[PDB]
Amino acid sequence: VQQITLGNSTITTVVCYAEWPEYLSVCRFYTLDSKTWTTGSKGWCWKLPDALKDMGVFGQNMFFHSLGRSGYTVHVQCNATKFHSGCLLVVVIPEHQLASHVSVKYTFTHPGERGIDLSSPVKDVIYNMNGTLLGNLLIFPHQFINLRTNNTATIVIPYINSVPIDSMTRHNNVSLMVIPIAPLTVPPSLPITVTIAPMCTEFS
Amino acid sequence: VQQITLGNSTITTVVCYAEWPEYLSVCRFYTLDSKTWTTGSKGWCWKLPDALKDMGVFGQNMFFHSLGRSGYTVHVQCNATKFHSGCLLVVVIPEHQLASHVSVKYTFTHPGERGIDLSSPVKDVIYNMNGTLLGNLLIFPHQFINLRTNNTATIVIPYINSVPIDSMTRHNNVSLMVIPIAPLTVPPSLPITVTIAPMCTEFS
Amino acid sequence: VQQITLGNSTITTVVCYAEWPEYLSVCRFYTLDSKTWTTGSKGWCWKLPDALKDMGVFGQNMFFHSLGRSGYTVHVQCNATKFHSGCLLVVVIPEHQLASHVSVKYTFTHPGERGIDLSSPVKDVIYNMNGTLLGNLLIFPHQFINLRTNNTATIVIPYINSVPIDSMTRHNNVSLMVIPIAPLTVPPSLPITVTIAPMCTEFS
Amino acid sequence: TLPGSGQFLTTDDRQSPSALPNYEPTPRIHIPGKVHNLLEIIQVDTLIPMNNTHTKDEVNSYLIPLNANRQNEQVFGTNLFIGDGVFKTTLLGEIVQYYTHWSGSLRFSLMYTGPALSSAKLILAYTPPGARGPQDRREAMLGTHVVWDIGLQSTIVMTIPWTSAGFLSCWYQTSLILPPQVYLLSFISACPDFKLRLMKDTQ
Amino acid sequence: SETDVECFLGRAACVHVTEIQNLFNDWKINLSSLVQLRKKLELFTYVRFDSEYTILATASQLVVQAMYVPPGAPNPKEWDDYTWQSASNPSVFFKVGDTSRFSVPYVGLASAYNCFYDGYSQYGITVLNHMGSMAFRIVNEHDEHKTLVKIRVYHRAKHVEAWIPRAPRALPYTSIGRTNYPPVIKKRDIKSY
Amino acid sequence: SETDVECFLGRAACVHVTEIQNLFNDWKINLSSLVQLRKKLELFTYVRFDSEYTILATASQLVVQAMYVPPGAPNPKEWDDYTWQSASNPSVFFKVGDTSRFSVPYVGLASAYNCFYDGYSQYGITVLNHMGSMAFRIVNEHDEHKTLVKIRVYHRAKHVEAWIPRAPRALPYTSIGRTNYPPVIKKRDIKSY
């Protein structure tokens, strides 16, 4: 029901491209720093597997072996009461080539667990970091989080890449982005907890 | 025949108490620094599992989990030609309480991969570090290495302890000692290579 | 076991291209002058059938009939004790076109039983007499003679030529070369006895 | 006529009229040692000129020198670039440099030529691509290796994993016991799984 | 049947319009130089198709060599280089005014070409979508006058396959291989029909 | 399948690049003149393949006769010799700018051509790998101006077979048919990776 248990960890609680992650150990829930959806937030972007580069055995085996191949189950939680409103857009962008704020430097294309706060590569949410309007980003696997309707969003990302295994430290397969379309109106801040659990994680 | 393969490693090449190591991953050959059996050597003492406290995954899991339980296959090699003589005494001493050169300090009872060179706790080889003559140490599982007769000695040590699992960092279950009884006479030094492979290694 | 008897002669003791010599009398062991592998030897080269141009019935029938076709079993022996070291490279080179020390004169391309001592055509062992490195000569049928490991080397050469029979006095089908790779280190000379026995010798 | 008619595409193999249709050429007989596939001859192990520290090419260039009274030092060390450096002139780098992509397993061998009284323990550690090559005997022994006793077994054969660049080092575990300079012989070959594609032309 | 990817991306486009002298130009095969083809290619992340070039050489006031240089072969540096005669570089000889036609297989290293690469191997500099290079030379010798042969190369993607549909591009391009951009939604009020 | 000898040695190489005047050149067919083809041929001792020439004649400021002279026929000594009209010499008539194409069978005397011959029949002078000779003449008559027709001959070995693999050649060549050579192993120390 509401107690998805994965490994030694336990938490309390939309298949991407209808292709379940599958093989050609390290499957646990990593709970990142909770983001504060203020009234003036423009979005968040998490790179995978770069977002898990320092998180225990997953982040260690990411740096030890060069080639790896991992799937994910992404839980994004915006806990709220029945008075709060707003909707977050959780999209998964394969090979999210960023546009610079000349190529974009490595420290920002690979930001790690913190990701890039778009309210601080280019941070213009209207062009999807690439000159494409944000509205046409709905072709990717998404789900709206309407506190009126929902409070959780789950995105099952398979391994999407052109080689069966690749260096996880130089290339992000997918990137989780959470962009607030309707602003938070409340009777002035609201936390977002993102917990990333790698599934079907393969190595060399 | 002569190519015992264990894991990702490969090497070129007497059951203790007739009790094979057995359960209630990390099994590989660790090749220590080769000792130089000079004409004036008095012996060597390796503590287990303390001798493997920093050797990769074995030494890491020794410090991560408190309780552990591991067996060993000890290969002690004194490579020589057909002109060299001498015999080394490889003995395994369970709960080898040392006598000080007041209790004996931790840095020497737990010497790690280097062990204690008895030619530098008390280092008197005649009393077995405890007031017992060296000759009565033959009740333990031993084998002589006569370069006339042999060049290798293998000692299979099971887990010998009074609790099923115990803290490996504060208590050495067994200690490998190699004491030269007949001195090396040659027509003036000879290397000894000791390779310790943990088998049946258990953790909490 | 160790007494290969061929004809009226008796001696005390790697198929080339896996093609056994075969027909479309004179099969005996000819023991050449023993070579002295000194510490400063660069190699030996024997031409066949030119190396047997004066050895009895084989060398006589080589000059009487123009066209002939013969196979060989080449025994190269470097007799030694169990203190001697070194390795000789016995290679068979089909159509070994030599490079001159303008074409190369007949007296040296056809040296007879003595062959060419490369320590005296071009005699540079590094270029295989042709501008090709000596290391890439291992594609031909070879065997190393390590006095540590072996003391004999046998090379079975079939008839390798583009016509079924050809004039043996103007064209060498194969050439035996023995090139010392590891130099002889001894506690300062060592004999090499080469005995060539023609097999499957055909004439017009 | 469709587009591209009357062109001469050099890669278009077509049948053509024979200028001598009556000439019956000399019949083909079976000469021994036919090579149908280049994977037949890269299976044969050839020497590696590993001692490039020599200023000229000579037979000593095939000899890796080993020295007595050496413990924990490095014997030799090499990269796996199959188009430049030490491998460019071996049979592997001489056929491999005709192509662009080499995906296949290798068989790397060594042979000790020292005296019958000499013995030594060398560590043959294989570091896969992406890690840094070991610079001491302990990082190498803690990895994947084979303890080859030169005194007992004079020849070792090591199967290098499928690669499609990794390092290879050698260290003295024990000191070399000399009799009352020694040389090492290294050989390289290809496993039968070695593919080759996009044949190129070096200029 | 016109909405299939074999028909949408698989139409002959002119990927390069050059002009040679009687001297040469090399060009990295990059279909993304065409904003009409680039705007169609960027609705997909990976796309794998065999190539097919039809080359039309026109004079302006003869034989044209069309050489496909595969990945890893050296490009010509002079009109009289040895690389022009390398046996591994396929070249087609056709007259000026006529048209040449050949096909190159899938020469990428991955299972598809990379239209976007989120990482480093230079964020856009990737060798997976490198199809090689084309060099052209009018084989003649000291012809007493110089005639400029305009060459028009028409590439047609065949056996087209596409994956990972992407958002359509609304704004123009500024660089090759990079998504760096310098209002597309035109203003109307919101209630007026 | 690219490592088979039918594909490795069997690719069209340009064996000769000449230039004729509006007068002739004879050339002993010798594929070993090309160090790119010679370096491929010298990894084998004997190799037997039927031949296939595609001849491209280009003008520079017409009909080109491509005559294959078999072993033993007399070569032309003047442009107006009787040997040009000998019925046993096959000749192909094609226009300048076009290309000719024909095939010659295995015309060697042994069961394979001899790439190396350890002996005398002149250590390299052997008649077993002699494939004959090619003579070219622009059939015209007192044309009021002289036009130089560059001819590019492309030979492609087909039905390739090889034997006796040899050591690969590391150093350059100095003569035709002789292995006479004038450090290839580049210096690194030996322990440094």
Side-chain angles (χ1 to χ4, degrees):
Chain A
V1 292
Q2 292 184 355
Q3 288 293 147
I4 302 314
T5 301
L6 196 68
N8 180 9
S9 295
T10 191
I11 63 168
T12 69
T13 301
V14 178
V15 181
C16 304
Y17 303 102
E19 206 272 329
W20 193 262
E22 191 258 326
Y23 299 101
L24 294 165
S25 309
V26 298
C27 50
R28 63 181 73 137
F29 295 111
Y30 295 99
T31 300
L32 278 64
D33 293 2
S34 165
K35 292 52 184 197
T36 175
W37 175 27
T38 174
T39 53
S41 291
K42 292 293 277 153
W44 302 271
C45 180
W46 294 274
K47 301 291 186 180
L48 286 74
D50 183 70
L52 303 177
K53 65 181 180 178
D54 61 334
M55 291 177 131
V57 182
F58 189 84
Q60 277 315 316
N61 289 337
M62 268 178 64
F63 285 107
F64 193 76
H65 297 88
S66 60
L67 300 73
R69 180 187 189 277
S70 63
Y72 305 103
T73 180
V74 175
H75 300 275
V76 287
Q77 301 181 355
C78 183
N79 51 1
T81 173
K82 293 78 68 180
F83 293 88
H84 298 350
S85 65
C87 278
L88 296 169
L89 173 64
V90 59
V91 294
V92 172
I93 309 311
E95 302 194 326
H96 185 203
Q97 184 179 343
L98 302 176
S100 292
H101 65 273
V102 173
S103 185
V104 54
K105 224 178 186 319
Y106 181 83
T107 54
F108 298 96
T109 59
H110 290 75
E113 185 184 2
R114 296 286 293 172
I116 301 307
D117 60 343
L118 273 177
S119 61
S120 176
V122 75
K123 299 179 182 68
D124 312 326
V125 67
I126 182 62
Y127 302 123
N128 174 223
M129 313 303 73
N130 61 320
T132 68
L133 281 48
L134 177 141
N136 298 253
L137 273 58
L138 281 293
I139 185 59
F140 299 110
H142 73 289
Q143 194 60 267
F144 283 89
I145 301 170
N146 187 357
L147 298 179
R148 179 61 194 196
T149 305
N150 290 356
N151 282 314
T152 305
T154 76
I155 300 91
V156 181
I157 306 165
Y159 176 71
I160 303 168
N161 201 355
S162 60
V163 295
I165 318 168
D166 207 341
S167 178
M168 302 178 81
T169 320
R170 73 187 183 190
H171 172 97
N172 293 319
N173 290 276
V174 301
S175 308
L176 272 288
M177 294 186 74
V178 177
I179 297 166
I181 173 168
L184 181 75
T185 303
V186 160
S189 298
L190 196 64
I192 298 172
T193 298
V194 60
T195 310
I196 308 295
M199 305 294 288
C200 184
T201 300
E202 287 176 346
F203 298 101
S204 171
Chain B
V1 292
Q2 292 184 355
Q3 288 293 147
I4 302 314
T5 301
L6 196 68
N8 180 9
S9 295
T10 191
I11 63 168
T12 69
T13 301
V14 178
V15 181
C16 304
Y17 303 102
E19 206 272 329
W20 193 262
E22 191 258 326
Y23 299 101
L24 294 165
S25 309
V26 298
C27 50
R28 63 181 73 137
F29 295 111
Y30 295 99
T31 300
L32 278 64
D33 293 2
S34 165
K35 292 52 184 197
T36 175
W37 175 27
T38 174
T39 53
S41 291
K42 292 293 277 153
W44 302 271
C45 180
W46 294 274
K47 301 291 186 180
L48 286 74
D50 183 70
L52 303 177
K53 65 181 180 178
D54 61 334
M55 291 177 131
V57 182
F58 189 84
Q60 277 315 316
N61 289 337
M62 268 178 64
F63 285 107
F64 193 76
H65 297 88
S66 60
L67 300 73
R69 180 187 189 277
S70 63
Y72 305 103
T73 180
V74 175
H75 300 275
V76 287
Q77 301 181 355
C78 183
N79 51 1
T81 173
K82 293 78 68 180
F83 293 88
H84 298 350
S85 65
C87 278
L88 296 169
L89 173 64
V90 59
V91 294
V92 172
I93 309 311
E95 302 194 326
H96 185 203
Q97 184 179 343
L98 302 176
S100 292
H101 65 273
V102 173
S103 185
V104 54
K105 224 178 186 319
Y106 181 83
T107 54
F108 298 96
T109 59
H110 290 75
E113 185 184 2
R114 296 286 293 172
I116 301 307
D117 60 343
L118 273 177
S119 61
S120 176
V122 75
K123 299 179 182 68
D124 312 326
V125 67
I126 182 62
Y127 302 123
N128 174 223
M129 313 303 73
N130 61 320
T132 68
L133 281 48
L134 177 141
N136 298 253
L137 273 58
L138 281 293
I139 185 59
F140 299 110
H142 73 289
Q143 194 60 267
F144 283 89
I145 301 170
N146 187 357
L147 298 179
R148 179 61 194 196
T149 305
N150 290 356
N151 282 314
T152 305
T154 76
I155 300 91
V156 181
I157 306 165
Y159 176 71
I160 303 168
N161 201 355
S162 60
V163 295
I165 318 168
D166 207 341
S167 178
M168 302 178 81
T169 320
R170 73 187 183 190
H171 172 97
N172 293 319
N173 290 276
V174 301
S175 308
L176 272 288
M177 294 186 74
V178 177
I179 297 166
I181 173 168
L184 181 75
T185 303
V186 160
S189 298
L190 196 64
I192 298 172
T193 298
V194 60
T195 310
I196 308 295
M199 305 294 288
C200 184
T201 300
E202 287 176 346
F203 298 101
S204 171
Chain C
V1 292
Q2 292 184 355
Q3 288 293 147
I4 302 314
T5 301
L6 196 68
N8 180 9
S9 295
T10 191
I11 63 168
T12 69
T13 301
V14 178
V15 181
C16 304
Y17 303 102
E19 206 272 329
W20 193 262
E22 191 258 326
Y23 299 101
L24 294 165
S25 309
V26 298
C27 50
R28 63 181 73 137
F29 295 111
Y30 295 99
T31 300
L32 278 64
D33 293 2
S34 165
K35 292 52 184 197
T36 175
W37 175 27
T38 174
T39 53
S41 291
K42 292 293 277 153
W44 302 271
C45 180
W46 294 274
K47 301 291 186 180
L48 286 74
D50 183 70
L52 303 177
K53 65 181 180 178
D54 61 334
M55 291 177 131
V57 182
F58 189 84
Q60 277 315 316
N61 289 337
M62 268 178 64
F63 285 107
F64 193 76
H65 297 88
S66 60
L67 300 73
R69 180 187 189 277
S70 63
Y72 305 103
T73 180
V74 175
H75 300 275
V76 287
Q77 301 181 355
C78 183
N79 51 1
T81 173
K82 293 78 68 180
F83 293 88
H84 298 350
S85 65
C87 278
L88 296 169
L89 173 64
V90 59
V91 294
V92 172
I93 309 311
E95 302 194 326
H96 185 203
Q97 184 179 343
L98 302 176
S100 292
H101 65 273
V102 173
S103 185
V104 54
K105 224 178 186 319
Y106 181 83
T107 54
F108 298 96
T109 59
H110 290 75
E113 185 184 2
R114 296 286 293 172
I116 301 307
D117 60 343
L118 273 177
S119 61
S120 176
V122 75
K123 299 179 182 68
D124 312 326
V125 67
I126 182 62
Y127 302 123
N128 174 223
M129 313 303 73
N130 61 320
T132 68
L133 281 48
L134 177 141
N136 298 253
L137 273 58
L138 281 293
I139 185 59
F140 299 110
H142 73 289
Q143 194 60 267
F144 283 89
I145 301 170
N146 187 357
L147 298 179
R148 179 61 194 196
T149 305
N150 290 356
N151 282 314
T152 305
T154 76
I155 300 91
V156 181
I157 306 165
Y159 176 71
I160 303 168
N161 201 355
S162 60
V163 295
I165 318 168
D166 207 341
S167 178
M168 302 178 81
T169 320
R170 73 187 183 190
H171 172 97
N172 293 319
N173 290 276
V174 301
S175 308
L176 272 288
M177 294 186 74
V178 177
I179 297 166
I181 173 168
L184 181 75
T185 303
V186 160
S189 298
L190 196 64
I192 298 172
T193 298
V194 60
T195 310
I196 308 295
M199 305 294 288
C200 184
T201 300
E202 287 176 346
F203 298 101
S204 171
Chain D
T1 58
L2 288 175
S5 297
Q7 74 180 3
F8 163 52
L9 177 61
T10 65
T11 190
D12 184 64
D13 300 337
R14 299 290 182 182
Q15 295 179 356
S16 294
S18 182
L20 295 176
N22 198 34
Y23 181 70
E24 43 181 4
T26 306
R28 222 189 67 180
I29 66 170
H30 270 207
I31 302 169
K34 183 194 280 289
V35 179
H36 298 250
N37 205 348
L38 291 184
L39 291 67
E40 294 263 356
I41 70 170
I42 53 172
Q43 173 66 31
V44 179
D45 48 353
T46 63
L47 286 165
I48 302 169
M50 193 80 74
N51 196 89
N52 291 66
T53 295
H54 192 191
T55 77
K56 292 189 292 185
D57 295 13
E58 209 188 6
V59 70
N60 290 55
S61 55
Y62 293 101
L63 301 176
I64 299 166
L66 267 170
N67 294 6
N69 297 264
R70 301 297 187 229
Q71 325 178 62
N72 289 337
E73 287 74 22
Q74 185 175 72
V75 179
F76 68 121
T78 321
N79 58 92
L80 274 69
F81 294 358
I82 312 289
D84 198 75
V86 301
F87 300 91
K88 186 256 173 194
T89 58
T90 65
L91 178 61
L92 268 64
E94 284 289 27
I95 293 171
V96 164
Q97 72 187 0
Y98 285 69
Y99 294 74
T100 307
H101 307 285
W102 83 92
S103 48
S105 298
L106 277 66
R107 180 180 118 191
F108 178 75
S109 300
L110 296 94
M111 182 181 290
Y112 180 72
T113 303
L117 186 43
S118 279
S119 67
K121 287 188 183 183
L122 301 185
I123 298 163
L124 292 161
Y126 169 66
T127 294
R132 297 299 205 293
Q135 285 191 77
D136 302 72
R137 190 268 313 157
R138 190 181 89 73
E139 185 183 2
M141 184 185 167
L142 184 169
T144 44
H145 70 77
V146 181
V147 183
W148 172 44
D149 192 274
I150 271 174
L152 305 179
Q153 187 193 259
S154 184
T155 52
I156 193 167
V157 60
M158 303 184 71
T159 173
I160 293 167
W162 182 77
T163 68
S164 180
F167 295 121
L168 285 167
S169 65
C170 176
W171 300 83
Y172 288 120
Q173 175 151 352
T174 69
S175 173
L176 173 69
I177 301 91
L178 55 83
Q181 303 166 30
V182 175
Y183 302 93
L184 188 51
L185 271 66
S186 179
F187 304 95
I188 196 69
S189 62
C191 290
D193 63 356
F194 183 80
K195 305 184 286 292
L196 216 49
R197 56 175 197 179
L198 177 63
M199 188 260 286
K200 193 171 66 183
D201 48 329
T202 300
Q203 299 334 323
Chain E
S1 183
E2 306 192 14
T3 58
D4 289 339
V5 300
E6 185 69 29
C7 299
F8 175 72
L9 284 167
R11 65 97 158 183
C14 84
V15 296
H16 188 68
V17 177
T18 186
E19 52 249 6
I20 304 91
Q21 296 176 357
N22 193 2
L23 188 58
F24 78 96
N25 180 7
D26 52 351
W27 171 59
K28 75 186 250 188
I29 293 171
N30 190 241
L31 272 62
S32 66
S33 64
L34 272 174
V35 296
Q36 166 83 19
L37 271 292
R38 187 171 25 180
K39 198 182 292 288
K40 288 167 323 180
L41 283 170
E42 289 187 359
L43 274 66
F44 302 101
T45 308
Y46 305 141
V47 188
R48 181 179 180 274
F49 52 83
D50 297 328
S51 179
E52 171 78 24
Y53 296 172
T54 301
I55 299 166
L56 179 68
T58 308
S60 177
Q61 294 168 358
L62 298 184
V63 177
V64 168
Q65 186 183 71
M67 179 175 69
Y68 173 91
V69 175
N75 218 2
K77 194 160 183 51
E78 292 279 328
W79 183 103
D80 274 317
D81 200 295
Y82 295 82
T83 55
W84 297 102
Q85 196 172 21
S86 293
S88 294
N89 298 326
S91 64
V92 181
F93 296 93
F94 68 103
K95 297 185 180 71
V96 176
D98 291 334
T99 174
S100 168
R101 193 183 182 96
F102 59 82
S103 65
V104 176
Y106 168 89
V107 77
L109 206 49
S111 57
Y113 300 124
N114 295 139
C115 318
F116 290 87
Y117 192 73
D118 191 3
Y120 291 75
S121 315
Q122 288 74 0
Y123 191 60
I125 304 300
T126 299
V127 68
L128 301 176
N129 71 14
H130 194 222
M131 292 178 213
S133 178
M134 203 67 73
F136 303 105
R137 72 179 171 103
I138 305 176
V139 58
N140 286 142
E141 282 286 83
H142 302 291
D143 175 17
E144 183 65 26
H145 300 291
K146 70 167 144 159
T147 55
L148 324 177
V149 181
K150 311 292 290 208
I151 284 176
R152 200 84 180 265
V153 184
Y154 283 86
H155 178 195
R156 182 178 69 88
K158 66 182 184 179
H159 298 90
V160 188
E161 285 291 359
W163 293 266
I164 308 137
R166 180 176 283 299
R169 191 179 178 94
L171 295 180
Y173 296 100
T174 58
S175 199
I176 40 171
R178 301 186 181 103
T179 194
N180 199 5
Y181 62 88
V184 184
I185 298 171
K186 303 182 268 190
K187 78 174 262 179
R188 286 264 183 95
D189 71 348
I190 168 172
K191 88 174 188 197
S192 56
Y193 299 92
Chain F
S1 183
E2 306 192 14
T3 58
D4 289 339
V5 300
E6 185 69 29
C7 299
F8 175 72
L9 284 167
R11 65 97 158 183
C14 84
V15 296
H16 188 68
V17 177
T18 186
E19 52 249 6
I20 304 91
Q21 296 176 357
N22 193 2
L23 188 58
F24 78 96
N25 180 7
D26 52 351
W27 171 59
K28 75 186 250 188
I29 293 171
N30 190 241
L31 272 62
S32 66
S33 64
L34 272 174
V35 296
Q36 166 83 19
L37 271 292
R38 187 171 25 180
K39 198 182 292 288
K40 288 167 323 180
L41 283 170
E42 289 187 359
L43 274 66
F44 302 101
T45 308
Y46 305 141
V47 188
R48 181 179 180 274
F49 52 83
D50 297 328
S51 179
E52 171 78 24
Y53 296 172
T54 301
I55 299 166
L56 179 68
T58 308
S60 177
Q61 294 168 358
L62 298 184
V63 177
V64 168
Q65 186 182 71
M67 179 175 69
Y68 173 91
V69 175
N75 218 2
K77 194 160 183 51
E78 292 279 328
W79 183 104
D80 274 317
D81 200 295
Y82 295 82
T83 55
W84 297 102
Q85 196 172 21
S86 293
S88 294
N89 298 326
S91 64
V92 181
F93 296 93
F94 68 103
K95 297 185 180 71
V96 176
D98 291 334
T99 174
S100 168
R101 193 183 182 96
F102 59 82
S103 65
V104 176
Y106 168 89
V107 77
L109 206 49
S111 57
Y113 300 124
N114 295 139
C115 318
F116 290 87
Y117 192 73
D118 191 3
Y120 291 75
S121 315
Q122 288 74 0
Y123 191 60
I125 304 300
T126 299
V127 68
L128 301 176
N129 71 14
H130 194 222
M131 292 178 213
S133 178
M134 203 67 73
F136 303 105
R137 72 179 171 103
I138 305 176
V139 58
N140 286 142
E141 282 286 83
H142 302 291
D143 175 17
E144 183 65 26
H145 300 291
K146 70 167 144 159
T147 55
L148 324 177
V149 181
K150 311 292 290 208
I151 284 176
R152 200 84 180 265
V153 184
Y154 283 86
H155 178 195
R156 182 178 69 88
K158 66 182 184 179
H159 298 90
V160 188
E161 284 291 359
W163 293 266
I164 308 137
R166 180 176 283 299
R169 191 179 178 94
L171 295 180
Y173 296 100
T174 58
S175 199
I176 40 171
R178 301 186 181 103
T179 194
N180 199 5
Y181 62 88
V184 184
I185 298 171
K186 303 182 268 190
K187 78 174 262 179
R188 286 264 183 95
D189 71 348
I190 168 172
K191 88 174 188 197
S192 56
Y193 299 92

